[PDB]
């Protein structure tokens, strides 16, 4: 009876000390996605709780923190695959950085002296236009759709030198209205409601 | 029967357009936690995915992207509660920025000229000591434990201009060895395995 | 125990002899929908097995048989509500009557002499143009979408003298790619993937 | 992980465009059955939702619409099996066409003028006898039972040129009192409650 | 302690129901068939401890049925009797003449065979009586299990050994549907022919 | 799918007409047991619903009806095994035939002229003493226990000319206090509550 | 969200520190019973996992350790009820102290210098006859049944000064053959398989 | 069928008379653990009740009764494995023998005269310090933690001449705050909340 107990204790030790012992996540996967509450990421990727490192922010956009996190998981925690997942009805496609900056300026905030990263004072902007850009709203970045942002994020990570390129990278769009992924720019909803010449079953 | 169908259609319409219509998440909650695969945050808070905007990065540390994200959720998306959740066996407590810096430098990386935020060129460091600091490992920030990091995060968020002062902020530490939250510095294990004078039952 | 047995047998008798005893379906409902295997109609309407009379044909289009069936359920079996449900990727929006007629003529069908209703010889056509229109493909009827066809079906039934004025009628479109209904012409999939000004959460 | 996601996206595209791509239902099966609420057809045939095209009308009787729908499903959508399912306590075996006509005539209807198919004006009758016959009640057709009607349907479809002769056609009767099919004319209930010579077990 | 003691008394009562004068949970006695397809408790919607269930070949009223029914009603407090015949009954597939000859072929002498070893007083003294003893439906003039259920109800209703206060009802177990029906009330035929229906108002 | 339906209907037909077609019960078994409500016979024998013919009377005692029934199942319905099951706290071991006789005499019953078997007039007793024996109470038959009665039942059936000699016969006693069978005269309850010299485990 | 968490931590703290904080078991119960593997005590007593302090030894016999443990649970941990459960087929009723003492002596054990309690050297015997008594076999204590032993245990604990007088004490016997309790010396089994005059149901 | 019944009666007879027949528990296992209500021992060892003899007292401490019981289970009942399981928040680590003795002495108890083992007069202490020592509180025995007590108990049993050499002995500590066993002095909880140099995943 004791040999099973000993076995299960060692298993529990490995799980509790993965980052000490150099054990990766179960699918060696890292996911860049959205903090949005409707983006239920795990079921749409077909993954289990311990399968991936899931990074989440406003819009699922590549920030310095996204790169910081991506660079550690890949280089140090054995991640070999990245999946970028933007989503539909994203808040970053509902406002602009100009509106947001003016909103804060009207409450007394001063973009030039606001401490954007208290733990890293080296990061300053010294411009109101850089403060607008910092929020990373779609229209300010010149992006029209989450599909375009998914591919854009894939490209940024693909070209960045902090990531090793044995790593495979792919981008998808989460559809909040159907809780399902699509490939960027592959929309079948217009095609199914129009005439289209079908073929006879062989 | 059609009226049941009509109300359910309006229900799913609002769900798909929450961000246009000004509908918050179900608990008006925002969580700052870790990307670690063993941190099953929803289960440990007793919530469903639709209840919160969950921000996740390497370490559950307050970054500019965390502040960016938290600032938008609180001011524009109606979030009134923030919960910071660090975790045990955090990868950020297993290495130093000095180790990580020398690793990348050994692969030909140049700290001063690497684009840390490609979409925000204004993000620049011009120093190796700043590059080491940018990774935000615990020891380099002077933090000894996830408990201390949970309390540090809450304190920064509480004193930040971009976050409303009426937002309720709280800290916890996710224990990967038990899949359970604890309050910072309130660890039940040590106390139960030593002598402590008991009380006679009344 | 005998009293319980007897009341369950009465219950069985009424269910087995609803049509003899003048008992309607559980929701006094009649559905016109499509035979398509992807149209799972009951779950999309939010009803149970015994709730409705469900009429199904090629395309969910109003035919004489549909009118015959609706006429009997409304006037004699006590149905007070009608729902019409067309669907996406319908076979009737994928070919033309020209195609189908040409195919059948090549296999030896005589448009004028073929028995369209073997049990009712009074139904005759005497033209190849009538044979094409009889198949009721969308393009031949001048209908551009399932949304348009759902509304057309509602109107025809709404204005037909064999269907009582007191019967309430509504139309919907079944989406095969989401297994869910929509109101005709209410498409949000374009709106969710492009910019649209949002409102701040109150 | 992405490969299995891409594999699932392709599969869902095929499902949404079956009629474009020339993909049949999962059984190549077509069912002519009744609209009656007590006829739970899929349960009785032991089939899953995507298995068959299911036509449903008043009585599960072969009409022009059923033939129309059967001709398309077999020739164009690759259906290789037809099953005709009538049912017990069918409303078409509870009334006559004469009753129904007199009822409608008393409410100002004129058999010769009423448009039986608004989308096909070429369908005219020019007689009250044809109008009475159009309702397809069992009595006016000389059909005594759902058993006899199921076989009549099978016969009609077997010898119709719009349905390919290599399609297998079978008939059954749905018993609403048992929620179970039976073969036509093979009713076990009489046989078990009379005297009948048995055989000794060896 | 007190809840264990209460449970101990409950188990004692259960173990000694016949000593203490405790009836079954429904005061019910069921006369039914031995057939393996007659799952009687399920069909009556009853739990195991609800009824005394008498079972024989055919669910036919015999001296043993009257004996058993007499004790359950008068001494064990049964107030309800349910008689349940069934479809495809073996007693409706053969006759006593067939079965008699079969045993005669195997060298059994109807007059000599001891029908109740524990009761020598039961003698028949005729070959016809031996045939009637098997109680096949034909030899009793019964066409259906419906008729046999009604006949069994009628016999028990009129018998002086069974209290007149007791409720007696008959049913027919349908093996093809695992369900009961009322005698002579068969829905299966009525649903498959023309019947003047009524319009819903 | 017709082949499947046909195959299931045949399986129903054989089950419904077992006694016509000459099909035995599943384990070719007949059981003589008691009508007592506490004797849950099937689960105590370890059998399923369709496994056995179960005969039940007042006391699990061999009577003419038990012999009649057992002769038919063995000779005609293919039963090759018999199991007799008496039980603890049997009502037949709780009263006497003399007591029951007196009770009925007080209600005005005439032992000479009571139709003991209405369907068989040839059964008569012509004695007060035979009326007492007819009830078959344990005391009157000279039976000490249910153990003795189970073995006495086995003997009677084993020596009876109407029951085939190759039929296997075994006796048991159902313990109502523990819902479990025992072999006759195997009482271990005394043995477990007193001293008995055990042996060292090898 | 943070309120349910704090509340669940409080409950976790109380549970983990019941002995420090002076919380009793859920029913204020202490059980003296046997180590035997067939004695499933909690289910026989009808109690839950956190209801009782369960003391278990060889035989369920009152030893110094039982008194030690009983006096602490009652005086300091708030236990107000005691239940003694001996069992049938107890190993202490299958052997004698003499043969066991002889067994150990044959292995080279020296009764007068064997440390019976290494943590308490004050416990000495200095006699082979004391060694025999120390094992506490039923025959050496003059106890003939588990029923007598249960009552003896109750009486010893009832008169002991280290056990409070307001504590309620009750004795039972666990039947390993039935997995069930009985009152001492009340055997149902002998009464059920014998004749006994019953009563008519009123 | 009787074949299965006779086989199951043999199994139950063996089960009821294991001590007579010389049949061990299912795993030949003896457990020394605590009477604490929170210690759910069988689920933590992955065993069923029939798998082991479980000794339980205040503390899970090796008393004379523990040795008595262990010597019988090992030598006579075939036990080949011993498992010692102390626990966290143990009452024996919450008070002292001095306090307990004082409590009893003030209530009128005379240490030297009280019968510590009524059935064994040979057990005498003749000292107040021995009375304090008799309770076996951790502090008096010089034991720091349940971990230390688990190893102590294992060592005492392993060196005792009444327990065979070949019996395998192992110690664990049950954590009430996680219902989980750990190896003595192998605590992951402290290691996971402080810095420790990790290794890069290969
Ligand atoms: Cl987002
Ligand atoms: Cl992390
Ligand atoms: Cl269709
Ligand atoms: Cl119908
Ligand atoms: Cl197709
Ligand atoms: Cl039968
Ligand atoms: Cl034999
Ligand atoms: Cl024991
Ligand atoms: Cl020694
Ligand atoms: Cl000596
Ligand atoms: Cl304890």
For every residue of chain C, which 3-state class applies, written as one string? CHHHHHHHHHHHHHHHCHHHHCCCCCCCEEEEEECCCCCCHHHHHCCCCCCEEEEEECCCCCCHHHHHHHHHHHHCCCCCEEEEEEECCCHHHCCCHHHHHHHHHHCCCCCCCCCCCCCCCCCCCCCHHHHHHHCCCHHHHCCCCHHHHHHHHHHHHHCCCCCCCCCEEEEEEEECCCCEEECCCCCCCCHHHCCCCCCCCC
Does F2 sit within 8 Å of D83, measured CB to CB?
A: yes
* Residue G38, min C-alpha distance to chain H (Å): 6
Contact of B145 with A123, CB cutoff 8 Å: no
Q: How far apart are CA D19 and CA C138, in angstroms?
A: 14
Q: How far apart are CA B94 and CA B139, in angstroms?
A: 9
Instruction: Enumerate residues 60 to 89 of chain E having a beta carbon within 8 A of any beta carbon in chain C.
Output: 80, 82
For Cα atoms B193, B199, B201, give the angle at the middle one, nearest 5 degrees. 120
Residue B155: Cβ within 10 Å count = 15
Indicate the helix (H) or strand (E) that contains A151.
Answer: helix A146-159
What secondary structure, in 3-state letters, does H160-190 show? CCCCCCCCEEEEEEEECCCCEEECCCCCHHH
Q: How far apart are CA A100 and CA G64, in angstroms?
A: 78
Query: To the nearest 10°, the Cα dihedral for E85, E87, E90, E94?
Result: 110
* CB proximity C37 to A under 8 Å: no
Residues 6+ apart with CB under 8 A from G112: G125, G126, G127, G128
Indicate the helix (H) or strand (E) that contains E65.
Answer: helix E63-74
Closest CA relative to residue F78, chosen from F103, F96, F53, F59: F53
Extract the tokens encoding G119.
């943590």
Q: How far apart are CA E98 and CA E68, in angstroms?
A: 29
Q: How far apart are CA G174 and CA G152, in angstroms?
A: 15
Indicate the helix (H) or strand (E) that contains A81.
Answer: strand A81-87
Locus of tokens 């929509």? C182
Distances in whole angstroms, Cα of residue A124 to Cα of each of A102, A159, E103: 19, 25, 111
Closest CA relative to residue F72, chosen from A127, A4, E93: E93
Whole-number Å distance, alpha carbon H167 to ligand 10 midpoint, is 29
* CB proximity A201 to D under 8 Å: yes
Q: How far apart are CA E140 and CA G175, in angstroms?
A: 54
Contact of G166 with G178, CB cutoff 8 Å: no
Contact of E78 with E156, CB cutoff 8 Å: no
* CB proximity H45 to A under 8 Å: yes
Does E16 sit within 8 Å of G192, measured CB to CB?
A: yes
Extract the tokens encoding E135.
């109680």
What values do phi and psi take at C57, rounded to 5?
-145, -175
Q: How far is CA A11 from the centre of its chain?
A: 31
| Number of residues assigned to chain G | 202
* CB proximity F4 to D under 8 Å: yes
* Residue C200, min C-alpha distance to chain D (Å): 35
Distances in whole angstroms, Cα of residue A63 to Cα of each of A68, A123, B119, D121: 9, 13, 7, 65
- The DSSP result for chain B, as a single string, is -HHHHHHHHHHHHHHHTHHHHT---TT-EEEEEE--TT--HHHHHT--GGGEEEEEETTS---HHHHHHHHHHHHTS---EEEEEEETT-GGGT--HHHHHHHHHHTT--TTTS-SSTT-TT----SHHHHHHHT--TGGGT--SHHHHHHHHHHHHHT-TTS-TTSEEEEEEEETTTTEEE-TT--HHHHHTS--------
Which of B14, B21, B22, B122 is the best substitution to test chain A (most A C-beta atoms within 10 A)?
B122
Q: How far apart are CA G16 and CA B192, in angstroms?
A: 7
Residue C170 falls in which region: left (phi positive, over 0), alpha (psi -120 to 50) or beta? beta
Closest CA relative to residue G102, chosen from G69, G129, G70: G129
Q: How far apart are CA G46 and CA E6, in angstroms?
A: 12
User: Which SS3 state, helix, strand or coil, does residue G172 take?
Assistant: strand
Do chains H and G have 3 or more beta-carbon pairs under 8 angstroms?
yes
Chain G residues whose beta carbon lies within 8 Å of the beta carbon of residue B45: 1, 5
Residues 6+ apart with CB under 8 A from E162: E66, E69, E70, E73, E81, E156, E168
Q: How far apart are CA G49 and CA H176, in angstroms?
A: 12
For residue G29, what are the β-bridge partners? Answer: G52, G81
Residues 6+ apart with CB under 8 A from B106: none
Q: How far apart are CA H166 and CA A4, in angstroms?
A: 20
Q: How far apart are CA B67 and CA B71, in angstroms?
A: 6
Q: How far apart are CA D129 and CA C46, in angstroms?
A: 41
Q: How far apart are CA B127 and CA B120, in angstroms?
A: 18
* CB proximity H131 to G under 8 Å: no
Q: How far apart are CA B120 and CA A141, in angstroms?
A: 10
Extract the tokens encoding H117.
């083992």
> What is the maximum span of chain B, computed from C-alpha positions, in angstroms?
71
For Cα atoms F100, F104, F106, give the angle at the middle one, nearest 5 degrees. 115
Closest CA relative to residue F26, chosen from F51, F54, F1: F51
Q: Pick from B63, B88, B122: which is nearest to A127 by CB? A: B122
Closest CA relative to residue F196, chosen from G172, G176, H18: H18
Q: How far apart are CA E121 and CA E102, in angstroms?
A: 26
Residues 6+ apart with CB under 8 A from E123: E115
Angle between helices B64-75 and A97-105 (to 10 degrees): 80
User: Which SS3 state, helix, strand or coil, does residue H142 take?
Assistant: coil
Q: How far apart are CA H148 and CA H168, in angstroms?
A: 19
Does C89 sit within 8 Å of A195, measured CB to CB?
A: no
Residues 6+ apart with CB under 8 A from C175: A189, A192, C87, C88, C181, C182
Contact of G171 with G149, CB cutoff 8 Å: no
Extract the tokens encoding F120.
């068989």
Q: How far is CA D174 from the centre of its chain?
A: 11
Whole-number Å distance, alpha carbon B93 to ligand 2 midpoint, is 10
Q: How far apart are CA C89 and CA A195, in angstroms?
A: 9
Q: How far is CA E190 from the centre of its chain?
A: 28
Locus of tokens 């032992």? F111
Extract the tokens encoding H6.
């006779």
Q: How far apart are CA F194 and CA H58, in angstroms?
A: 31
Residues 6+ apart with CB under 8 A from G24: B201, G18, G77, G78, G79
User: Which SS3 state, helix, strand or coil, does residue G115 take?
Assistant: coil
- The DSSP result for A40-71, as a single string, is -HHHHHT--TTSEEEEEESSS---HHHHHHHH
Give the burial string for D13-37 (b: 16+ CB within 10 Å, else e). bebbbbbbebbbbebbbbbbbbbbb
Closest CA relative to residue H95, chosen from G20, B86, B125: G20
Residue C157: Cβ within 10 Å count = 24
Contact of F81 with F154, CB cutoff 8 Å: no
Contact of H55 with H33, CB cutoff 8 Å: yes
User: Which SS3 state, helix, strand or coil, does residue F169 take?
Assistant: strand
Angle between helices C64-75 and D64-75 (to 10 degrees): 130
| Number of residues assigned to chain C | 202
Distances in whole angstroms, Cα of residue H81 to Cα of each of B121, H58, H85: 68, 22, 13
* Residue B172, min C-alpha distance to chain C (Å): 27
Beta strand pairing status for B52-57 and B29-34?
Answer: parallel
* Residue E129, min C-alpha distance to chain C (Å): 35
For Cα atoms C96, C97, C98, give the angle at the middle one, nearest 5 degrees. 85
Contact of F21 with F14, CB cutoff 8 Å: yes
The DSSP code for F91 is: G
Distances in whole angstroms, Cα of residue D57 to Cα of each of C56, D61, D91: 7, 7, 11
* CB proximity C166 to E under 8 Å: no
Residue F10: Cβ within 10 Å count = 11
Closest CA relative to residue D198, chosen from C186, H55, E89: E89
The H-assigned helical ranges of chain F are 2-16, 18-21, 41-45, 64-75, 97-106, 128-134, 138-141, 146-158
Extract the tokens encoding G129.
């006859």
Chain A residues whose beta carbon lies within 8 Å of the beta carbon of residue B134: 64, 68, 120, 122
Cα-trace Rg, chain B: 21
Chain A residues whose beta carbon lies within 8 Å of the beta carbon of residue H46: 1, 4-5
Sign of CA dihedral D32, D36, D37, D43: negative
Q: How far apart are CA F130 and CA F136, in angstroms?
A: 10
Contact of H156 with G118, CB cutoff 8 Å: yes
Closest CA relative to residue E84, chosen from E64, E63, E56, E49: E56
Contact of F134 with E119, CB cutoff 8 Å: yes
Beta strand pairing status for H180-182 and H168-175?
Answer: antiparallel
Sign of CA dihedral C129, C130, C131, C135: positive
Could you give all domains of chain B from N- to C-terminal order, each with its CATH number?
3-182 (3.40.1050.10)
């Amino acid at each position: 009876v004791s040999e099973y107990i000993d076995s299960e204790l060692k298993r529990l030790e490995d799980y509790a000390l993965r980052r000490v012992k150099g054990i990766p996540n179960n699918r060696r996967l890292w996911v860049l996605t959205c903090m949005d509450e409707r983006v239920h990421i795990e079921q749409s990727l077909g993954i289990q709780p311990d399968d991936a490192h899931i990074y989440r922010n406003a819009g699922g956009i590549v920030t310095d923190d996204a790169i910081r996190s991506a660079s550690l998981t890949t280089n140090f925690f054995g991640t070999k695959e990245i999946i970028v997942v933007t989503h539909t009805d994203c808040g970053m496609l509902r406002f602009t950085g100009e509106e947001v900056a003016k909103y804060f300026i009207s409450k007394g905030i001063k973009p030039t002296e606001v401490q954007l990263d208290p733990l890293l004072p080296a990061f300053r902007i010294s411009s109101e236009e850089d403060f607008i850009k910092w929020f990373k709203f779609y229209e300010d970045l010149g992006v029209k759709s989450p599909d375009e942002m998914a591919l854009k994020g894939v490209e940024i990570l693909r070209n960045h030198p902090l990531i090793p390129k044995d790593v495979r990278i792919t981008g998808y769009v989460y559809e909040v209205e159907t809780h399902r992924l699509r490939k960027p720019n592959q929309i079948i909803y217009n095609e199914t409601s129009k005439f289209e010449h079908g073929t006879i079953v062989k």
